[PDB]
CSV table of C-alpha atoms and ligand atoms in Angstrom, one decimal:
chain,number,residue,atom,x,y,z
A,1,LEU,CA,-11.9,1.3,-20.4
A,2,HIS,CA,-9.9,3.8,-22.5
A,3,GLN,CA,-12.6,3.6,-25.2
A,4,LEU,CA,-15.5,4.0,-22.7
A,5,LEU,CA,-13.8,7.0,-20.9
A,6,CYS,CA,-13.2,8.7,-24.4
A,7,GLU,CA,-17.0,8.2,-25.2
A,8,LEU,CA,-18.1,9.6,-21.8
A,9,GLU,CA,-15.7,12.6,-22.3
A,10,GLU,CA,-17.6,13.5,-25.6
A,11,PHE,CA,-20.4,15.0,-23.3
A,12,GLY,CA,-18.1,17.7,-21.7
A,13,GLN,CA,-18.4,19.3,-18.2
A,14,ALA,CA,-21.6,19.9,-16.2
A,15,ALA,CA,-27.6,17.0,-19.2
A,16,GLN,CA,-27.2,13.9,-16.8
A,17,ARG,CA,-24.3,12.6,-19.0
A,18,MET,CA,-22.2,15.8,-18.5
A,19,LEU,CA,-19.1,15.0,-16.4
A,20,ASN,CA,-18.8,15.8,-12.7
A,21,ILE,CA,-14.9,16.1,-13.0
A,22,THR,CA,-12.3,17.0,-15.5
A,23,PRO,CA,-10.4,14.2,-17.2
A,24,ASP,CA,-7.2,15.5,-15.6
A,25,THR,CA,-8.9,15.2,-12.2
A,26,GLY,CA,-9.6,11.5,-13.0
A,27,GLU,CA,-5.9,11.1,-13.9
A,28,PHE,CA,-4.9,12.7,-10.6
A,29,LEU,CA,-7.2,10.3,-8.7
A,30,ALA,CA,-5.7,7.4,-10.7
A,31,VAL,CA,-2.2,8.3,-9.4
A,32,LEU,CA,-3.3,9.0,-5.8
A,33,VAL,CA,-5.2,5.7,-5.3
A,34,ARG,CA,-2.2,3.7,-6.6
A,35,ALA,CA,0.5,5.7,-4.8
A,36,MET,CA,-1.2,5.5,-1.4
A,37,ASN,CA,-2.2,1.8,-1.9
A,38,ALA,CA,-5.8,3.0,-1.1
A,39,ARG,CA,-7.5,-0.4,-1.4
A,40,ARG,CA,-10.7,0.9,0.3
A,41,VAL,CA,-12.2,3.9,-1.5
A,42,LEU,CA,-15.4,5.8,-0.8
A,43,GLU,CA,-16.9,8.2,-3.3
A,44,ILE,CA,-19.8,10.6,-2.5
A,45,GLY,CA,-21.3,11.7,-5.8
A,46,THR,CA,-21.3,8.9,-8.4
A,47,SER,CA,-23.1,11.1,-11.0
A,48,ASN,CA,-22.9,8.9,-14.3
A,49,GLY,CA,-19.9,6.9,-12.9
A,50,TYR,CA,-17.1,8.7,-14.9
A,51,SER,CA,-15.1,9.5,-11.6
A,52,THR,CA,-16.0,6.0,-10.3
A,53,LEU,CA,-14.4,4.4,-13.3
A,54,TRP,CA,-11.0,6.1,-12.7
A,55,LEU,CA,-11.2,5.1,-9.0
A,56,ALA,CA,-12.3,1.5,-9.9
A,57,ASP,CA,-9.5,1.0,-12.4
A,58,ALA,CA,-7.0,2.3,-9.7
A,59,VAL,CA,-8.3,-0.1,-6.9
A,60,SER,CA,-8.3,-3.0,-9.5
A,61,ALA,CA,-4.4,-2.5,-9.7
A,62,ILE,CA,-4.2,-3.0,-5.9
A,63,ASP,CA,-7.0,-5.6,-5.5
A,64,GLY,CA,-9.3,-3.1,-3.7
A,65,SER,CA,-12.9,-1.8,-4.1
A,66,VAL,CA,-14.9,1.4,-4.5
A,67,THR,CA,-18.1,2.2,-2.6
A,68,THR,CA,-20.0,5.0,-4.3
A,69,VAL,CA,-23.2,7.0,-3.4
A,70,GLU,CA,-25.6,8.9,-5.7
A,71,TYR,CA,-28.8,10.7,-4.7
A,72,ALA,CA,-30.4,10.8,-8.3
A,73,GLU,CA,-31.9,7.6,-9.8
A,74,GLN,CA,-31.4,9.0,-13.4
A,75,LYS,CA,-27.6,9.4,-12.8
A,76,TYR,CA,-27.4,6.1,-10.9
A,77,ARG,CA,-28.9,4.1,-13.8
A,78,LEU,CA,-26.5,5.8,-16.3
A,79,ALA,CA,-23.7,4.8,-13.9
A,80,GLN,CA,-24.9,1.2,-13.7
A,81,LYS,CA,-25.0,1.0,-17.6
A,82,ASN,CA,-21.4,2.5,-17.8
A,83,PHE,CA,-20.1,0.0,-15.1
A,84,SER,CA,-21.8,-3.0,-17.0
A,85,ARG,CA,-19.6,-2.1,-20.0
A,86,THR,CA,-16.4,-2.9,-18.2
A,87,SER,CA,-14.9,-5.8,-16.2
A,88,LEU,CA,-14.7,-3.3,-13.2
A,89,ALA,CA,-18.4,-3.5,-12.0
A,90,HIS,CA,-17.3,-6.3,-9.5
A,91,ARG,CA,-15.0,-3.7,-7.9
A,92,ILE,CA,-17.8,-1.2,-7.4
A,93,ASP,CA,-20.6,-1.1,-4.6
A,94,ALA,CA,-22.9,1.6,-6.2
A,95,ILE,CA,-25.5,2.8,-3.7
A,96,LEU,CA,-28.6,4.8,-4.8
A,97,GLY,CA,-29.5,6.8,-1.6
A,98,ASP,CA,-28.8,9.7,0.8
A,99,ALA,CA,-25.1,10.3,1.6
A,100,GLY,CA,-26.0,11.7,5.1
A,101,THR,CA,-27.7,8.2,5.9
A,102,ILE,CA,-25.0,6.1,4.2
A,103,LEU,CA,-22.2,8.0,6.1
A,104,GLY,CA,-24.1,7.9,9.5
A,105,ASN,CA,-24.2,4.1,9.3
A,106,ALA,CA,-20.6,3.2,7.9
A,107,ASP,CA,-18.0,1.8,10.4
A,108,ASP,CA,-14.9,3.7,11.8
A,109,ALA,CA,-11.6,3.8,9.9
A,110,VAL,CA,-12.9,1.6,7.0
A,111,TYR,CA,-11.7,3.8,4.1
A,112,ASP,CA,-8.2,4.7,2.8
A,113,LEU,CA,-9.4,7.5,0.4
A,114,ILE,CA,-12.7,9.4,0.3
A,115,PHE,CA,-13.5,11.4,-2.9
A,116,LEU,CA,-16.3,14.0,-2.3
A,117,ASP,CA,-18.1,15.5,-5.2
A,118,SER,CA,-21.7,16.1,-3.9
A,119,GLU,CA,-23.9,18.8,-2.3
A,120,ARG,CA,-21.2,21.1,-0.9
A,121,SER,CA,-23.6,22.8,1.6
A,122,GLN,CA,-23.9,19.4,3.4
A,123,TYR,CA,-20.1,18.9,4.0
A,124,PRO,CA,-19.9,20.6,7.4
A,125,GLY,CA,-22.8,18.4,8.7
A,126,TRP,CA,-21.1,15.2,7.3
A,127,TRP,CA,-17.7,16.1,8.7
A,128,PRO,CA,-17.8,14.1,12.0
A,129,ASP,CA,-18.8,11.0,9.9
A,130,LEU,CA,-16.2,11.7,7.1
A,131,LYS,CA,-13.4,12.1,9.8
A,132,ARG,CA,-14.4,8.9,11.6
A,133,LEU,CA,-14.7,6.8,8.3
A,134,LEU,CA,-11.2,7.9,7.1
A,135,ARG,CA,-8.4,5.7,8.6
A,136,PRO,CA,-5.5,7.5,10.3
A,137,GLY,CA,-3.1,8.1,7.5
A,138,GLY,CA,-5.9,8.3,4.9
A,139,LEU,CA,-6.7,11.0,2.4
A,140,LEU,CA,-9.9,13.1,1.7
A,141,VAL,CA,-10.1,14.6,-1.8
A,142,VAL,CA,-12.8,17.2,-2.4
A,143,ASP,CA,-13.7,18.5,-5.9
A,144,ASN,CA,-14.8,22.1,-6.9
A,145,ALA,CA,-12.6,23.7,-4.1
A,146,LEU,CA,-11.7,26.6,-6.4
A,147,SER,CA,-14.8,26.7,-8.7
A,148,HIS,CA,-17.0,27.0,-5.5
A,149,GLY,CA,-14.7,28.5,-2.9
A,150,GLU,CA,-17.5,30.4,-1.2
A,151,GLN,CA,-19.7,27.3,-0.9
A,152,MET,CA,-16.7,25.2,0.3
A,153,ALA,CA,-15.4,27.9,2.8
A,154,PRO,CA,-17.2,26.7,6.0
A,155,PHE,CA,-16.1,23.1,5.4
A,156,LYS,CA,-12.5,24.1,4.5
A,157,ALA,CA,-12.3,26.2,7.7
A,158,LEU,CA,-13.5,23.2,9.9
A,159,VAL,CA,-10.9,20.8,8.4
A,160,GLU,CA,-8.1,23.4,8.5
A,161,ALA,CA,-8.9,24.0,12.3
A,162,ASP,CA,-8.5,20.2,13.0
A,163,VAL,CA,-4.8,19.7,14.2
A,164,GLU,CA,-5.2,16.0,13.2
A,165,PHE,CA,-5.3,17.0,9.5
A,166,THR,CA,-2.6,18.3,7.0
A,167,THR,CA,-4.2,20.1,4.1
A,168,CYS,CA,-3.6,21.7,0.7
A,169,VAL,CA,-5.4,22.8,-2.5
A,170,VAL,CA,-4.3,21.5,-5.9
A,171,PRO,CA,-5.6,23.6,-8.9
A,172,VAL,CA,-6.3,20.5,-11.1
A,173,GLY,CA,-9.7,20.8,-12.8
A,174,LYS,CA,-12.2,22.7,-10.6
A,175,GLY,CA,-9.7,22.5,-7.7
A,176,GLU,CA,-9.0,19.7,-5.2
A,177,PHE,CA,-9.0,20.2,-1.4
A,178,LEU,CA,-6.8,17.5,0.1
A,179,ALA,CA,-6.8,16.6,3.8
A,180,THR,CA,-4.8,13.7,5.3
A,181,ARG,CA,-5.5,12.4,8.8
A,182,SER,CA,-2.4,12.1,11.1
A,183,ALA,CA,-1.4,8.9,12.7
A,184,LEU,CA,-2.3,8.9,16.4
A,185,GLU,CA,0.4,8.5,19.1
A,186,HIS,CA,1.6,4.8,19.2
A,187,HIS,CA,4.0,2.8,21.5
B,1,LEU,CA,9.5,25.5,11.7
B,2,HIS,CA,6.5,27.8,10.8
B,3,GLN,CA,8.6,30.8,11.8
B,4,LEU,CA,11.6,29.6,9.7
B,5,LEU,CA,9.5,28.8,6.6
B,6,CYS,CA,7.9,32.3,6.8
B,7,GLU,CA,11.4,33.9,7.0
B,8,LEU,CA,12.6,31.8,4.0
B,9,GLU,CA,9.5,32.8,2.1
B,10,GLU,CA,10.5,36.5,2.5
B,11,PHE,CA,13.1,36.0,-0.4
B,12,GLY,CA,10.5,35.0,-3.1
B,13,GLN,CA,10.8,32.7,-6.1
B,14,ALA,CA,14.1,32.1,-8.2
B,15,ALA,CA,20.0,35.2,-5.2
B,16,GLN,CA,20.9,31.8,-3.6
B,17,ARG,CA,18.2,32.4,-0.9
B,18,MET,CA,15.4,32.6,-3.6
B,19,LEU,CA,13.0,29.6,-3.4
B,20,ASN,CA,13.2,26.6,-5.7
B,21,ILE,CA,9.4,25.9,-5.1
B,22,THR,CA,6.3,27.8,-4.3
B,23,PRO,CA,4.9,27.5,-0.7
B,24,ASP,CA,1.8,25.7,-2.0
B,25,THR,CA,4.1,23.2,-3.7
B,26,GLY,CA,5.6,22.6,-0.2
B,27,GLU,CA,2.1,22.1,1.2
B,28,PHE,CA,1.4,19.6,-1.5
B,29,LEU,CA,4.5,17.6,-0.7
B,30,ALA,CA,3.6,17.7,3.0
B,31,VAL,CA,0.2,16.0,2.2
B,32,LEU,CA,1.7,13.5,-0.3
B,33,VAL,CA,4.5,12.3,2.1
B,34,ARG,CA,2.1,11.8,5.0
B,35,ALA,CA,-0.8,10.3,2.9
B,36,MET,CA,1.5,7.7,1.2
B,37,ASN,CA,3.4,6.9,4.4
B,38,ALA,CA,6.6,7.7,2.4
B,39,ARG,CA,9.1,7.1,5.2
B,40,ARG,CA,12.1,7.0,2.8
B,41,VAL,CA,12.3,10.2,0.7
B,42,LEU,CA,14.9,11.2,-1.9
B,43,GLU,CA,15.2,14.9,-3.0
B,44,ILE,CA,17.4,15.9,-6.0
B,45,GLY,CA,17.9,19.6,-5.8
B,46,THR,CA,18.2,20.8,-2.1
B,47,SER,CA,18.8,24.5,-3.1
B,48,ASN,CA,18.7,26.4,0.3
B,49,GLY,CA,16.7,23.5,2.0
B,50,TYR,CA,13.2,25.2,1.8
B,51,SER,CA,11.7,22.1,-0.1
B,52,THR,CA,13.7,19.8,2.2
B,53,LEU,CA,12.1,21.3,5.4
B,54,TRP,CA,8.6,20.5,4.1
B,55,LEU,CA,9.7,16.9,3.3
B,56,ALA,CA,11.6,16.5,6.6
B,57,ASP,CA,8.6,17.7,8.7
B,58,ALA,CA,6.4,15.2,6.8
B,59,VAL,CA,8.8,12.2,7.3
B,60,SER,CA,9.1,13.3,11.0
B,61,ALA,CA,5.4,12.6,11.4
B,62,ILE,CA,5.9,9.0,10.1
B,63,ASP,CA,9.4,8.4,11.7
B,64,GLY,CA,11.1,8.5,8.3
B,65,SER,CA,14.1,10.3,6.7
B,66,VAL,CA,15.0,12.5,3.7
B,67,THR,CA,18.2,12.1,1.7
B,68,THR,CA,18.8,15.3,-0.4
B,69,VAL,CA,21.5,16.2,-3.1
B,70,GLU,CA,22.8,19.6,-4.1
B,71,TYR,CA,25.5,20.5,-6.7
B,72,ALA,CA,26.3,24.0,-5.4
B,73,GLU,CA,28.4,24.5,-2.1
B,74,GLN,CA,26.9,28.0,-1.6
B,75,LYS,CA,23.3,26.6,-1.6
B,76,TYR,CA,24.3,23.6,0.5
B,77,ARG,CA,25.8,25.7,3.3
B,78,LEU,CA,22.6,27.9,3.4
B,79,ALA,CA,20.7,24.6,3.6
B,80,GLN,CA,22.9,23.4,6.5
B,81,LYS,CA,22.3,26.7,8.4
B,82,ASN,CA,18.5,26.4,7.8
B,83,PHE,CA,18.5,22.7,9.0
B,84,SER,CA,20.6,23.6,12.1
B,85,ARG,CA,17.7,26.0,13.1
B,86,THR,CA,15.2,23.1,13.5
B,87,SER,CA,15.0,19.8,15.4
B,88,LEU,CA,14.7,18.2,11.9
B,89,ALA,CA,18.4,18.1,10.9
B,90,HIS,CA,18.6,14.5,12.4
B,91,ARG,CA,16.0,13.4,9.8
B,92,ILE,CA,18.0,14.8,6.8
B,93,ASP,CA,21.0,13.3,5.0
B,94,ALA,CA,22.2,16.4,3.0
B,95,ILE,CA,24.8,15.4,0.4
B,96,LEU,CA,26.9,18.0,-1.5
B,97,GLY,CA,27.8,16.3,-4.8
B,98,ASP,CA,26.8,15.2,-8.3
B,99,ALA,CA,23.2,13.7,-8.6
B,100,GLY,CA,24.2,11.5,-11.6
B,101,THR,CA,26.9,9.9,-9.2
B,102,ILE,CA,24.7,9.7,-6.1
B,103,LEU,CA,21.9,8.1,-8.2
B,104,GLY,CA,24.3,5.6,-10.0
B,105,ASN,CA,25.4,4.2,-6.6
B,106,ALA,CA,22.1,4.1,-4.5
B,107,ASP,CA,20.4,0.6,-4.0
B,108,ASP,CA,17.3,-0.7,-5.7
B,109,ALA,CA,13.7,0.1,-4.4
B,110,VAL,CA,15.1,2.1,-1.4
B,111,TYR,CA,12.8,5.2,-1.7
B,112,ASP,CA,9.0,5.6,-1.3
B,113,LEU,CA,8.9,9.1,-2.8
B,114,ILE,CA,11.5,11.0,-5.0
B,115,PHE,CA,11.2,14.8,-5.4
B,116,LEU,CA,13.1,16.1,-8.5
B,117,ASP,CA,14.0,19.8,-8.8
B,118,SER,CA,17.4,19.9,-10.5
B,119,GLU,CA,18.9,20.2,-14.0
B,120,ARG,CA,16.0,19.1,-16.2
B,121,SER,CA,18.3,18.3,-19.2
B,122,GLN,CA,19.8,15.5,-17.1
B,123,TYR,CA,16.5,13.7,-16.3
B,124,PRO,CA,16.4,11.4,-19.3
B,125,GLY,CA,20.0,10.2,-18.5
B,126,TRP,CA,19.0,9.6,-14.8
B,127,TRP,CA,15.8,7.8,-15.6
B,128,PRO,CA,17.1,4.2,-15.4
B,129,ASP,CA,18.5,5.0,-11.9
B,130,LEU,CA,15.3,7.0,-10.8
B,131,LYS,CA,13.1,4.0,-11.9
B,132,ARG,CA,15.2,1.4,-10.1
B,133,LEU,CA,15.5,3.5,-6.8
B,134,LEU,CA,11.7,4.0,-6.6
B,135,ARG,CA,10.0,1.1,-4.9
B,136,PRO,CA,7.1,-0.5,-6.7
B,137,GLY,CA,4.1,1.5,-5.5
B,138,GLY,CA,6.3,4.6,-5.0
B,139,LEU,CA,5.8,8.1,-6.3
B,140,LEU,CA,8.1,10.4,-8.4
B,141,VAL,CA,7.2,14.2,-8.1
B,142,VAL,CA,8.9,16.5,-10.6
B,143,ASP,CA,8.8,20.4,-10.3
B,144,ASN,CA,8.7,22.9,-13.1
B,145,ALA,CA,6.6,20.6,-15.4
B,146,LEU,CA,4.6,23.5,-16.7
B,147,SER,CA,7.0,26.4,-16.3
B,148,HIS,CA,9.6,24.4,-18.4
B,149,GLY,CA,7.4,22.0,-20.5
B,150,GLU,CA,9.9,22.1,-23.5
B,151,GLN,CA,12.9,21.2,-21.3
B,152,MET,CA,10.8,18.5,-19.5
B,153,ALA,CA,9.3,17.1,-22.7
B,154,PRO,CA,11.9,14.3,-23.5
B,155,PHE,CA,11.7,13.0,-19.9
B,156,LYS,CA,7.9,13.2,-19.7
B,157,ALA,CA,7.7,11.2,-23.0
B,158,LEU,CA,10.1,8.5,-21.6
B,159,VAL,CA,8.0,8.1,-18.4
B,160,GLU,CA,4.7,8.2,-20.2
B,161,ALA,CA,5.9,5.4,-22.6
B,162,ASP,CA,6.7,3.1,-19.6
B,163,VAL,CA,3.6,0.8,-19.0
B,164,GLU,CA,4.9,0.3,-15.4
B,165,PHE,CA,4.0,4.0,-14.6
B,166,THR,CA,0.7,5.8,-14.1
B,167,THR,CA,1.2,9.6,-14.5
B,168,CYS,CA,-0.5,13.0,-14.3
B,169,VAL,CA,0.3,16.7,-14.2
B,170,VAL,CA,-0.9,18.9,-11.2
B,171,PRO,CA,-0.8,22.7,-11.9
B,172,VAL,CA,0.4,23.6,-8.4
B,173,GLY,CA,3.2,26.1,-8.3
B,174,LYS,CA,5.3,25.7,-11.5
B,175,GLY,CA,3.6,22.4,-12.2
B,176,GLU,CA,4.2,18.9,-10.8
B,177,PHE,CA,4.7,15.8,-13.0
B,178,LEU,CA,3.7,12.8,-10.9
B,179,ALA,CA,4.5,9.2,-11.8
B,180,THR,CA,3.7,6.1,-9.7
B,181,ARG,CA,5.3,2.8,-10.3
B,182,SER,CA,2.9,-0.2,-10.6
B,183,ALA,CA,3.2,-3.2,-8.3
B,184,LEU,CA,4.7,-6.2,-10.1
B,185,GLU,CA,2.7,-9.5,-10.6
B,186,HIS,CA,2.6,-11.3,-7.2
B,187,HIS,CA,1.4,-14.8,-6.2
C,201,LIG,MG1,-17.5,18.1,-9.4
C,202,LIG,MG1,11.9,24.3,-9.0
């Protein structure tokens, strides 16, 4: 895994082999998945699977799984090759398809952590599905929050207006927008 | 709480009323405590209680508690006044004393999250106690990791050498060093 990550890092930041996240964003996800015991992870935006490998290693440490979604066949096949080079492929459900469809069909409260690194213009439309898929207590992590503040702004505003979420921005890599869903009232 | 935090923020960054963390560090702690369901928090370095209030609000949302430690009576009494101005004082065990003593005496695996913002030269000496107090799966968050990299370096090296920890650095505020303790082998 260490060797494979180092080889993938030789291509630098985003042609299909260029990385969708910084290495220190991957390190951040590694800590978050372990620290919140996030056994059920969803990723929207596999790219070549670099981010997925950090998530998959993390869920392997807590006997969990990653479901990832990628629009582009070219990136998906690179991702399949990368996963085939590790013992972690069995922990990854890699879907080649349309995230709006995949999100529309998933079940309620099924994910502990969702990592979003896809088409930012789509996020406001996906928000009802992202909110219902995230368990109460779960965490949403969104990449490119500072590199692409203007594109992210409508989505960040929707999430910040939702009293059921606590949010922040972490300037790791291209910026992470974090949002955690409150527990509901219980007896 | 919002009103009290805004008033405390009028004093800016570190004389006893000047803040020990940035507001966006407080927002980060708010998300972390909720997202990891960290009902048992330990803080080393209360200062005037600004950081403590973010932690206390967070644990209030998950019916938890914060134990905080401050060396300086002047800062401790400011912290008591600030806590007395909220419904959250009942969630805070504020100890005026020596962190090396308090840590030496606490029980094993009693804390979900530990926030360190104290005398950085001391951290390597405290490390055996910090490791044993943090539950497996728990998170250590250390402030001033980038503002004071040289002072932090021996401690960061000890923690990075420990195969039971997964680590990263988040450039929020003066820099957060995060370290999460692995689960042990289970049946
Ligand atoms: Mg990205
Ligand atoms: Mg500080």
